Amino acid sequence: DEELQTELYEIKHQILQTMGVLSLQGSMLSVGDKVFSTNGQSVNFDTIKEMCTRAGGNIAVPRTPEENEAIASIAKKYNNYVYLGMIEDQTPGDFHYLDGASVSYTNWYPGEPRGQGKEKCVEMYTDGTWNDRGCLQYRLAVCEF
Amino acid sequence: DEELQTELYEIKHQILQTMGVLSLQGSMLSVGDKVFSTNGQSVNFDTIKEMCTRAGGNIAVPRTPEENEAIASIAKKYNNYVYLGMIEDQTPGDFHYLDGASVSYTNWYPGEPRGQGKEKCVEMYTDGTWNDRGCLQYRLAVCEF
Amino acid sequence: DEELQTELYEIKHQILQTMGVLSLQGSMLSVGDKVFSTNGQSVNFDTIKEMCTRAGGNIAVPRTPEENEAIASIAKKYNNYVYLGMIEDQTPGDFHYLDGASVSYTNWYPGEPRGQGKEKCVEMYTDGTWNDRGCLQYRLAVCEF
Ligand SMILES: [Ca+2]
Ligand SMILES: [Ca+2]
Ligand SMILES: [Ca+2]
């Protein structure tokens, strides 16, 4: 269709414009096909999950070095640790994404994880490395869409 | 078309991402197919209408309990009354949306409306109930898109 | 396609909603098919170019009176001059857009340009008129998408 082609072009341009504005003003960070954003609040794991789902997204989880660096830049920006989208398996030391799949990419701080099963959550330090920790602390809420 | 399907999927995802960011940061509230947002300014009815149309929208008007609660949450958030998108008919006590249609859903504070035709505008209290009032007061500008 | 028509309508509405929110909150200004926005930072020409490209856009450049007035309103809003997307040719007095094409629309302050080739950049005063100037000053970063 000849009109369909032009309509799609305009639609794609408008999306580029809206995403460009959000990017320019630091409202979000786009990495590949993933968009990260924070509301600036520091709350516990359960609360963060609720906030993200309310917005139509999920708690952020890095699956590549580039995504990890992006979340880390936000942690650094707000000078606060970030809870990530993963929880410990029944077997201590093993973690899984919230959908149940086993974690692949990892960036544990040397020595971590070592909570012996008592720290089922994972927090990201400002340098981007990870630490298994309890889930009741107040951490920066970072979501992915 | 095989490429049209993938293009639309990506377009829809990007929209979800941009709307998710705006939602997460409290820049807007989505209720069904309607989006509410405020610039935080408190001005009169005529001014609000101009501001909304300038942005490509219209003065907010709740047509369902869910929409009413959404606008109320914004009123509460900014601790200020909100002018709604309706004005009094020639017959006192009867109101109409700006397009001329008679108002259906209402949420008048007990006793309202009772301006006897001297208060053609409608303001929303922070608890979400309505009050007919003059149109020259300074009220939170809430628009719908 | 009967479903394609409805899908496009919804997509276009969502775009209108997201753009309406950004417009209402002063996050951007739309003029025709062009969107202008600033991150509020004041840096040199090279830095501005980087910031804009990072966001998926380019340094703003007015090509019509309407676009010029839009950028001027932003300069006025932030009370700071704005570097524009153009640089001087090898021949003093002649300027070109960054893609190499010769500038068409101009709005030089009376007497400008007169840097004799020593001021290859162009800054916009808050009244919207232009002045050729060095490229190392700190100016409001305004991008176009
Ligand atoms: Ca640990
Ligand atoms: Ca009354
Ligand atoms: Ca000069």
Side-chain angles (χ1 to χ4, degrees):
Chain A
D1 192 300
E2 18 67 59
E3 293 185 301
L4 180 283
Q5 190 60 60
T6 172
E7 275 197 62
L8 290 180
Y9 182 100
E10 302 188 309
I11 290 299
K12 293 185 294 182
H13 182 206
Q14 293 173 304
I15 292 300
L16 172 155
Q17 300 177 308
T18 59
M19 300 196 82
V21 170
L22 292 174
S23 176
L24 177 69
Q25 309 194 321
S27 304
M28 61 172 226
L29 280 182
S30 183
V31 178
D33 190 50
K34 186 175 284 192
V35 165
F36 296 111
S37 185
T38 179
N39 55 19
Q41 298 188 60
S42 180
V43 298
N44 61 36
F45 181 92
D46 283 350
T47 305
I48 296 174
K49 188 158 62 288
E50 306 183 311
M51 301 176 139
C52 294
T53 58
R54 198 197 319 295
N58 299 89
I59 172 61
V61 67
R63 294 175 185 263
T64 71
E66 192 168 62
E67 290 183 7
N68 199 83
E69 305 177 313
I71 300 172
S73 75
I74 295 176
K76 179 178 179 179
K77 177 178 174 181
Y78 289 76
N79 189 53
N80 191 185
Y81 297 173
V82 180
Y83 269 138
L84 304 178
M86 51 179 62
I87 52 176
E88 200 173 14
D89 293 10
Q90 290 182 176
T91 296
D94 301 319
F95 293 71
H96 58 274
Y97 300 112
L98 277 55
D99 68 1
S102 290
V103 178
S104 53
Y105 167 82
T106 62
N107 193 44
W108 299 110
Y109 183 75
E112 303 302 334
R114 54 184 175 74
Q116 305 301 297
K118 296 186 175 183
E119 303 177 306
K120 60 179 182 177
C121 279
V122 180
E123 59 182 7
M124 179 185 281
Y125 290 150
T126 57
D127 66 4
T129 56
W130 313 352
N131 174 52
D132 56 320
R133 181 67 167 285
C135 307
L136 309 181
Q137 301 301 297
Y138 295 153
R139 297 287 181 270
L140 184 67
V142 182
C143 307
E144 63 175 42
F145 303 86
Chain B
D1 192 300
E2 18 67 59
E3 293 185 301
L4 180 283
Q5 190 60 60
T6 172
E7 275 197 62
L8 290 180
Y9 182 100
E10 302 188 309
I11 290 299
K12 293 185 294 182
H13 182 206
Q14 293 173 304
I15 292 300
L16 172 155
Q17 300 177 308
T18 59
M19 300 196 82
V21 170
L22 292 174
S23 176
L24 177 69
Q25 309 194 321
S27 304
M28 61 172 226
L29 280 182
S30 183
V31 178
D33 190 50
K34 186 175 284 192
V35 165
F36 296 111
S37 185
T38 179
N39 55 19
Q41 298 188 60
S42 180
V43 298
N44 61 36
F45 181 92
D46 283 350
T47 305
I48 296 174
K49 188 158 62 288
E50 306 183 311
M51 301 176 139
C52 294
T53 58
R54 198 197 319 295
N58 299 89
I59 172 61
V61 67
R63 294 175 185 263
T64 71
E66 192 168 62
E67 290 183 7
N68 199 83
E69 305 177 313
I71 300 172
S73 75
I74 295 176
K76 179 178 179 179
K77 177 178 174 181
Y78 289 76
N79 189 53
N80 191 185
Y81 297 173
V82 180
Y83 269 138
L84 304 178
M86 51 179 62
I87 52 176
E88 200 173 14
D89 293 10
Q90 290 182 176
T91 296
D94 301 319
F95 293 71
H96 58 274
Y97 300 112
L98 277 55
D99 68 1
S102 290
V103 178
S104 53
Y105 167 82
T106 62
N107 193 44
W108 299 110
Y109 183 75
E112 303 302 334
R114 54 184 175 74
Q116 305 301 297
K118 296 186 175 183
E119 303 177 306
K120 60 179 182 177
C121 279
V122 180
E123 59 182 7
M124 179 185 281
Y125 290 150
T126 56
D127 66 4
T129 56
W130 313 352
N131 174 52
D132 56 320
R133 181 67 167 285
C135 307
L136 309 181
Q137 301 301 297
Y138 295 153
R139 297 287 181 270
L140 184 67
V142 182
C143 307
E144 63 175 42
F145 303 86
Chain C
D1 192 300
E2 18 67 59
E3 293 185 301
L4 180 283
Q5 190 60 60
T6 172
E7 275 197 62
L8 290 180
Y9 182 100
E10 302 188 309
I11 290 299
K12 293 185 294 182
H13 182 206
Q14 293 173 304
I15 292 300
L16 172 155
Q17 300 177 308
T18 59
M19 300 196 82
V21 170
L22 292 174
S23 176
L24 177 69
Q25 309 194 321
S27 304
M28 61 172 226
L29 280 182
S30 183
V31 178
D33 190 50
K34 186 175 284 192
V35 165
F36 296 111
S37 185
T38 179
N39 55 19
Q41 298 188 60
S42 180
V43 298
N44 61 36
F45 181 92
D46 283 350
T47 305
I48 296 174
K49 188 158 62 288
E50 306 183 311
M51 301 176 139
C52 294
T53 58
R54 198 197 319 295
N58 299 89
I59 172 61
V61 67
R63 294 175 185 263
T64 71
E66 192 168 62
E67 290 183 7
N68 199 83
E69 305 177 313
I71 300 172
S73 75
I74 295 176
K76 179 178 179 179
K77 177 178 174 181
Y78 289 76
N79 189 53
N80 191 185
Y81 297 173
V82 180
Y83 269 138
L84 304 178
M86 51 179 62
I87 52 176
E88 200 173 14
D89 293 10
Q90 290 182 176
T91 296
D94 301 319
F95 293 71
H96 58 274
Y97 300 112
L98 277 55
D99 68 1
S102 290
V103 178
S104 53
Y105 167 82
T106 62
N107 193 44
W108 299 110
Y109 183 75
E112 303 302 334
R114 54 184 175 74
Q116 305 301 297
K118 296 186 175 183
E119 303 177 306
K120 60 179 182 177
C121 279
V122 180
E123 59 182 7
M124 179 185 281
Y125 290 150
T126 57
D127 66 4
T129 56
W130 313 352
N131 174 52
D132 56 320
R133 181 67 167 285
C135 307
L136 309 181
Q137 301 301 297
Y138 295 153
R139 297 287 181 270
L140 184 67
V142 182
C143 307
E144 63 175 42
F145 303 86

